[PDB]
RNA sequence: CAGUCCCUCCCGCUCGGGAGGAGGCACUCUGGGGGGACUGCCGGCGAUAAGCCGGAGGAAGGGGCGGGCGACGGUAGGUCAGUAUGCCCCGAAACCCCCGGGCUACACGCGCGCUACAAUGGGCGGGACAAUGGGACCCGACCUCGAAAGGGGAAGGGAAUCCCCUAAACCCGCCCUCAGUUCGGAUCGCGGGCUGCAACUCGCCCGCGUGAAGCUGGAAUCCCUAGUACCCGCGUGUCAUCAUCGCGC
């Protein structure tokens, strides 16, 4: 009963790894992180600006 | 259409209340007048030579006061 | 926004001081001296005191 | 006749420049025959992201690029060749993927 | 499309669009001759960047200006006897092609109609439809007042094309008339200083008020 | 001979050689193109060169990219191109030059990216 | 000489006004009464309109060597108004396409590729550029420069 | 005739065939399109030629659209809820059967019952600050 | 059909036209580098300096084009409803889980985008056309059935290899004839399609009778200035659907 129900679709269904929020999830090629963590992330996986 | 055309000779510098109105020296070319140099008042731009047409040969510019 | 930076109007009177004949007025000809004698990577200052030594050594023989 | 077709990518270009320089260095000193490096279109990965952590403040957005840089070498049939390219060392971003067409 | 092959081999030998090349074409008040390009040119058309040039804009083709002019008047400030001008079905703005179609059509209207050469006619229209004084304001002591300016002769043309193209949206909007039969009438009655053309009448416009204000 | 064409996107690639005169656009006639103003851009180069090398030379060409109005107007650097290399004459190409100053340079314009703020109408484009 | 060589509009009139003739195509019960797309606003206003697809669909055959139907839908599809909302890029029918694809693969002059496409057999070609090439005769007497 | 009466409603012949149908409360333009190909004449000739013979074959495809050719659902209401069967209304018919679905919504209290009620949209309008 | 012996197909006026294989690397192209381009020079201006103007030559020229890069403090701005967290408060609750509804509710005020306010026009048919990126329960070509949304099968594809693939703007052969209508579809009811446990609160689309207001809008009013304004569309992020949105082409 304290199980939660199994979602392959929806925001309740993605989750970002780090902060654990249920907003904005970008899937790019398979990230799992906030829009907004990742800019504490950008210069470590690589991102550049230009 | 009893207009005297003339030619802008010099161009003192821009004037009117926003800067789009360029006061010029013109020479009458055709006209009463003939030849008389007048300093008069040109909206739209201008170079020396332009072909300027005018309405009154009496009306001149006041010295600007800078 | 022409004015030649500062440091170029530093770097080039030395650079002329030093090797004044080996400058003259040619653009290119001053341009690659400029590039084997100094270290620039960016082409672009890399010409830049090439213009500014140019007119430099126009200015010697003027007076 | 044979063709091993060795694709190396990275995003560092002068890793991918090192290891195309070795790999044609040796397939010279083994005298093999070997289509020069063709450089790929890059990838070019384009990501958008507000910067307003909130929804307070005028919409700025900041764009940040991957390239992502590839190279085809098509050498010919060589076992001597193909014994050589497993000992190159290989910088950690360079893969390399090595396979045969007839 | 014979009619479209035949407009195509015609000016093979050097004729503005179609026909009736430049050579015949003359300029009658001595102020727009360095002004009016008249140079023999197939396409009026340059994607010039005349703009940049503080005065490039001499160089482009008599016509090409008017195009200019045709394809950006439509939604502004202006509510002429309040009236409301825009292009809301398949406006001209980017349809350069569209503007292309519709003067041709004017062209070809305006042979059938005056039968001469109609670069001569729009000549005399643009020389008739010039306003030469207008109004200005200048203050001192706080004293704004008004006072009469001459124009300089490139923005005569400019207002002369903007009259011109106005007019054609003026006329063509909200009526079962179309737009080539509007641009061909403005034209037609501002080259005979015909008073009910909009241009003309506003040309006396402008060059009255400017003749009572000094 | 091999001649080169660029305008925006339209890419122009020519091939002149000796024949009756059959030029062809990606293998179509140029009198046949339904867009006319188009067709008066590509034939300028050739109506300001001459009857005599038009009927002298015979000129392949493919344009790729861009639209119809950017191939027409790579169509017409590649016959410029063409047929002053061809020729290789001075007074032709400072004839072109008279006509317009793009006939042997062309036009270096590109698009600009689109800015934020509502980047759908434009680079600079913006909101109320 | 060749389709190629010669304008769309009239070798599409030419194909049609030929193919009219021939008895294996014609528009189905259902062609009358329904539009030849989704985008499409009103009805088809001529009766031959059914045939003009076939004088097209078979040109697409003869250029782009197989063809399916979802393609040829993207090609023929058109612009929409949405109300309110805007003008929108949507796909044709298909099986209005798929019927004159099927007529003209009983006409033998297209067959099918299974799992490439529809292609055009050589009589379609030699059908095809024969117009052309007829078209060519005439637009070189009323345009001399074609002999070129 | 500048004046046609066809099933009870009055057009003009000025208009073309399927446009002169198009008056008709119960025909629309693919409608009188269709039903005039059925017919087997071009809906494009001008309405002040109508006959009574074709007057009466337009009268009988709008009382029996499915026998006359026309598919099942170019109707205005297939699958009729009193009947089962698809079927054509033409003015006051389709006015009872729309009066007829009101009340029904109304009686079964359906949500789509109270928006109509109120006049009301139903839908899913977002009623804020449009309307 | 860049030139194209040889081979294949079709046609012709027998001139040749077009297409593939053979084989080549020709132009752009993809990308490893360098040059060119720099007040470089003419003249003037400017103290002869700085630097400016005009000129020519040059593909491109006197901050080459657009950005990244915005220091010191202030606004006690917003963000503890995300991350680290001062302090306080609940502890079967100020905990957790499950579900029905709400977050979409309206006499209404305001802002921003989308469209409708036709003869430029709506409808049939032809044709010149890209491009940013994406695709694995996916791109999905493609065979076949069903109007159709789609179903059965199905090649290729984890990225210059296959698909999304069509751009859109445009012109013409033709039809309609200045009208709240052949504009425009809101608004209803019907019957079908996709998704998901399921959409009436709470998806859209496919076709059917139906057709609102709107037919150019006051004082006043915001912003762009050369590939730019205007104007026109494609794609994709997030994502089964939802955005008329944002993004960027």
Same mark, same amino acid.
């Given at each position: 009963?304290?199980?939660?129900?199994?979602?392959?679709?929806?925001?309740?269904?993605?989750?970002?790894?780090?902060?654990?929020?249920?907003?904005?999830?970008?899937?790019?090629?398979?990230?799992?992180?906030?829009?907004?963590?990742?800019?504490?992330?950008?210069?470590?996986?690589?991102?550049?600006?230009? | 259409?009893?207009?005297?055309?003339?030619?802008?000779?010099?161009?003192?510098?821009?004037?009117?209340?926003?800067?789009?109105?360029?006061?010029?020296?013109?020479?009458?070319?055709?006209?009463?007048?003939?030849?008389?140099?007048?300093?008069?008042?040109?909206?739209?731009?201008?170079?020396?030579?332009?072909?300027?047409?005018?309405?009154?040969?009496?009306?001149?510019?006041?010295?600007?006061?800078? | 926004?022409?004015?030649?930076?500062?440091?170029?109007?530093?770097?080039?009177?030395?650079?002329?001081?030093?090797?004044?004949?080996?400058?003259?007025?040619?653009?290119?000809?001053?341009?690659?001296?400029?590039?084997?004698?100094?270290?620039?990577?960016?082409?672009?200052?890399?010409?830049?005191?090439?213009?500014?030594?140019?007119?430099?050594?126009?200015?010697?023989?003027?007076? | 006749?044979?063709?091993?077709?060795?694709?190396?990518?990275?995003?560092?270009?002068?890793?991918?420049?090192?290891?195309?320089?070795?790999?044609?260095?040796?397939?010279?000193?083994?005298?093999?025959?070997?289509?020069?490096?063709?450089?790929?279109?890059?990838?070019?990965?384009?990501?958008?992201?507000?910067?307003?952590?909130?929804?307070?403040?005028?919409?700025?957005?900041?764009?940040?690029?991957?390239?992502?840089?590839?190279?085809?070498?098509?050498?010919?049939?060589?076992?001597?060749?193909?014994?050589?390219?497993?000992?190159?060392?290989?910088?950690?971003?360079?893969?390399?993927?090595?396979?045969?067409?007839? | 499309?014979?009619?479209?092959?035949?407009?195509?081999?015609?000016?093979?030998?050097?004729?503005?669009?179609?026909?009736?090349?430049?050579?015949?074409?003359?300029?009658?008040?001595?102020?727009?001759?360095?002004?009016?390009?008249?140079?023999?040119?197939?396409?009026?058309?340059?994607?010039?960047?005349?703009?940049?040039?503080?005065?490039?804009?001499?160089?482009?083709?008599?016509?090409?200006?008017?195009?200019?002019?045709?394809?950006?008047?439509?939604?502004?400030?202006?509510?002429?006897?309040?009236?409301?001008?825009?292009?809301?079905?398949?406006?001209?703005?980017?349809?350069?092609?569209?503007?292309?179609?519709?003067?041709?059509?004017?062209?070809?209207?305006?042979?059938?109609?005056?039968?001469?050469?109609?670069?001569?006619?729009?000549?005399?229209?643009?020389?008739?439809?010039?306003?030469?004084?207008?109004?200005?304001?200048?203050?001192?002591?706080?004293?704004?007042?008004?006072?009469?300016?001459?124009?300089?002769?490139?923005?005569?043309?400019?207002?002369?094309?903007?009259?011109?193209?106005?007019?054609?949206?003026?006329?063509?909007?909200?009526?079962?008339?179309?737009?080539?039969?509007?641009?061909?009438?403005?034209?037609?009655?501002?080259?005979?200083?015909?008073?009910?053309?909009?241009?003309?009448?506003?040309?006396?416009?402008?060059?009255?008020?400017?003749?009572?204000?000094? | 001979?091999?001649?080169?064409?660029?305008?925006?996107?339209?890419?122009?690639?020519?091939?002149?050689?000796?024949?009756?005169?059959?030029?062809?656009?990606?293998?179509?006639?140029?009198?046949?193109?339904?867009?006319?103003?188009?067709?008066?851009?590509?034939?300028?180069?050739?109506?300001?060169?001459?009857?005599?090398?038009?009927?002298?030379?015979?000129?392949?060409?493919?344009?790729?990219?861009?639209?119809?109005?950017?191939?027409?107007?790579?169509?017409?650097?590649?016959?410029?191109?063409?047929?002053?290399?061809?020729?290789?004459?001075?007074?032709?190409?400072?004839?072109?030059?008279?006509?317009?100053?793009?006939?042997?340079?062309?036009?270096?314009?590109?698009?600009?990216?689109?800015?934020?703020?509502?980047?759908?109408?434009?680079?600079?484009?913006?909101?109320? | 000489?060749?389709?190629?060589?010669?304008?769309?509009?009239?070798?599409?009139?030419?194909?049609?006004?030929?193919?009219?003739?021939?008895?294996?195509?014609?528009?189905?019960?259902?062609?009358?009464?329904?539009?030849?797309?989704?985008?499409?606003?009103?009805?088809?206003?001529?009766?031959?309109?059914?045939?003009?697809?076939?004088?097209?669909?078979?040109?697409?055959?003869?250029?782009?060597?197989?063809?399916?139907?979802?393609?040829?839908?993207?090609?023929?599809?058109?612009?929409?108004?949405?109300?309110?909302?805007?003008?929108?890029?949507?796909?044709?029918?298909?099986?209005?396409?798929?019927?004159?694809?099927?007529?003209?693969?009983?006409?033998?002059?297209?067959?099918?590729?299974?799992?490439?496409?529809?292609?055009?057999?050589?009589?379609?070609?030699?059908?095809?550029?024969?117009?052309?090439?007829?078209?060519?005769?005439?637009?070189?007497?009323?345009?001399?420069?074609?002999?070129? | 005739?500048?004046?046609?009466?066809?099933?009870?409603?009055?057009?003009?012949?000025?208009?073309?065939?399927?446009?002169?149908?198009?008056?008709?409360?119960?025909?629309?333009?693919?409608?009188?399109?269709?039903?005039?190909?059925?017919?087997?004449?071009?809906?494009?000739?001008?309405?002040?030629?109508?006959?009574?013979?074709?007057?009466?074959?337009?009268?009988?495809?709008?009382?029996?659209?499915?026998?006359?050719?026309?598919? #099942?659902?170019?109707?205005?209401?297939?699958?009729?809820?009193?009947?089962?069967?698809?079927?054509?209304?033409?003015?006051?018919?389709?006015?009872?059967?729309?009066?007829?679905?009101?009340?029904?919504?109304?009686?079964?209290?359906?949500?789509?019952?109270? #928006?109509?009620?109120?006049?009301?949209?139903?839908?899913?309008?977002?009623?804020?600050?449009?309307?």
């Amino acid at each position: 009963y304290n199980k939660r129900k199994p979602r392959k679709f929806g925001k309740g269904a993605r989750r970002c790894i780090r902060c654990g929020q249920y907003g904005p999830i970008i899937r790019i090629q398979g990230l799992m992180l906030c829009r907004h963590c990742f800019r504490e992330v950008a210069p470590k996986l690589g991102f550049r600006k230009y | 259409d009893e207009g005297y055309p003339a030619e802008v000779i010099e161009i003192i510098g821009r004037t009117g209340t926003t800067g789009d109105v360029t006061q010029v020296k013109v020479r009458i070319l055709e006209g009463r007048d003939k030849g008389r140099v007048i300093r008069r008042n040109v909206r739209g731009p201008v170079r020396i030579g332009d072909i300027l047409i005018l309405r009154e040969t009496e009306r001149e510019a006041r010295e600007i006061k800078s | 926004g022409k004015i030649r930076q500062g440091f170029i109007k530093r770097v080039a009177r030395e650079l002329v001081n030093k090797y004044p004949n080996e400058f003259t007025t040619d653009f290119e000809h001053n341009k690659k001296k400029v590039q084997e004698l100094t270290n620039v990577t960016s082409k672009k200052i890399r010409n830049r005191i090439a213009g500014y030594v140019t007119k430099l050594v126009r200015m010697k023989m003027e007076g | 006749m044979q063709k091993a077709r060795i694709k190396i990518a990275s995003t560092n270009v002068r890793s991918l420049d090192e290891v195309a320089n070795q790999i044609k260095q040796i397939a010279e000193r083994t005298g093999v025959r070997m289509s020069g490096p063709i450089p790929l279109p890059t990838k070019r990965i384009r990501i958008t992201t507000r910067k307003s952590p909130d929804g307070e403040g005028s919409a700025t957005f900041d764009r940040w690029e991957l390239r992502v840089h590839k190279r085809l070498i098509d050498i010919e049939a060589d076992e001597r060749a193909m014994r050589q390219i497993m000992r190159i060392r290989v910088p950690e971003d360079v893969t390399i993927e090595i396979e045969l067409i007839s | 499309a014979k009619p479209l092959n035949e407009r195509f081999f015609i000016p093979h030998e050097i004729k503005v669009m179609g026909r009736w090349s430049t050579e015949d074409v003359e300029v009658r008040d001595p102020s727009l001759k360095p002004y009016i390009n008249l140079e023999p040119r197939l396409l009026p058309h340059t994607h010039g960047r005349h703009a940049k040039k503080h005065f490039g804009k001499a160089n482009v083709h008599i016509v090409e200006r008017l195009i200019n002019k045709i394809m950006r008047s439509g939604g502004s400030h202006y509510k002429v006897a309040g009236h409301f001008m825009r292009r809301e079905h398949r406006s001209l703005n980017s349809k350069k092609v569209k503007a292309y179609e519709v003067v041709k059509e004017a062209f070809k209207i305006i042979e059938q109609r005056t039968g001469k050469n109609p670069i001569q006619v729009l000549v005399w229209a643009i020389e008739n439809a010039a306003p030469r004084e207008d109004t200005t304001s200048v203050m001192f002591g706080g004293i704004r007042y008004h006072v009469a300016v001459d124009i300089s002769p490139m923005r005569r043309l400019d207002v002369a094309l903007r009259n011109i193209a106005l007019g054609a949206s003026a006329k063509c909007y909200r009526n079962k008339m179309s737009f080539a039969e509007a641009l061909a009438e403005e034209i037609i009655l501002a080259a005979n200083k015909d008073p009910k053309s909009y241009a003309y009448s506003k040309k006396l416009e402008i060059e009255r008020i400017a003749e009572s204000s000094r | 001979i091999q001649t080169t064409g660029k305008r925006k996107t339209a890419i122009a690639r020519a091939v002149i050689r000796e024949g009756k005169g059959r030029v062809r656009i990606n293998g179509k006639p140029v009198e046949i193109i339904e867009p006319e103003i188009a067709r008066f851009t590509i034939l300028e180069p050739l109506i300001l060169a001459g009857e005599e090398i038009w009927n002298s030379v015979d000129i392949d060409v493919k344009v790729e990219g861009g639209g119809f109005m950017g191939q027409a107007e790579a169509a017409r650097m590649a016959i410029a191109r063409a047929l002053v290399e061809w020729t290789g004459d001075m007074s032709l190409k400072e004839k072109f030059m008279k006509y317009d100053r793009t006939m042997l340079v062309g036009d270096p314009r590109r698009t600009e990216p689109h800015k934020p703020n509502r980047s759908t109408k434009g680079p600079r484009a913006k909101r109320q | 000489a060749t389709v190629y060589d010669v304008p769309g509009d009239l070798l599409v009139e030419r194909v049609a006004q030929r193919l009219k003739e021939i008895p294996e195509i014609k528009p189905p019960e259902w062609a009358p009464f329904v539009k030849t797309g989704r985008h499409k606003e009103r009805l088809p206003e001529q009766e031959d309109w059914w045939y003009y697809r076939v004088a097209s669909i078979l040109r697409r055959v003869y250029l782009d060597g197989p063809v399916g139907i979802e393609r040829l839908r993207t090609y023929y599809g058109g612009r929409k108004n949405r109300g309110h909302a805007p003008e929108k890029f949507y796909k044709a029918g298909g099986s209005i396409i798929r019927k004159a694809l099927q007529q003209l693969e009983a006409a033998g002059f297209v067959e099918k590729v299974p799992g490439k496409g529809r292609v055009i057999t050589p009589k379609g070609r030699s059908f095809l550029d024969k117009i052309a090439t007829e078209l060519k005769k005439e637009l070189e007497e009323i345009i001399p420069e074609l002999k070129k | 005739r500048h004046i046609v009466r066809v099933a009870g409603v009055d057009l003009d012949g000025n208009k073309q065939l399927r446009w002169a149908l198009t008056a008709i409360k119960g025909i629309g333009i693919n409608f009188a399109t269709m039903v005039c190909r059925v017919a087997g004449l071009d809906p494009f000739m001008k309405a002040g030629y109508l006959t009574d013979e074709q007057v009466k074959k337009i009268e009988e495809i709008l009382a029996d659209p499915v026998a006359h050719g026309i598919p #099942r659902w170019a109707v205005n209401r297939p699958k009729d809820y009193e009947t089962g069967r698809d079927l054509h209304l033409i003015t006051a018919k389709l006015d009872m059967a729309i009066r007829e679905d009101i009340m029904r919504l109304r009686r079964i209290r359906a949500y789509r019952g109270i #928006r109509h009620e109120l006049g009301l949209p139903v839908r899913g309008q977002r009623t804020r600050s449009n309307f």
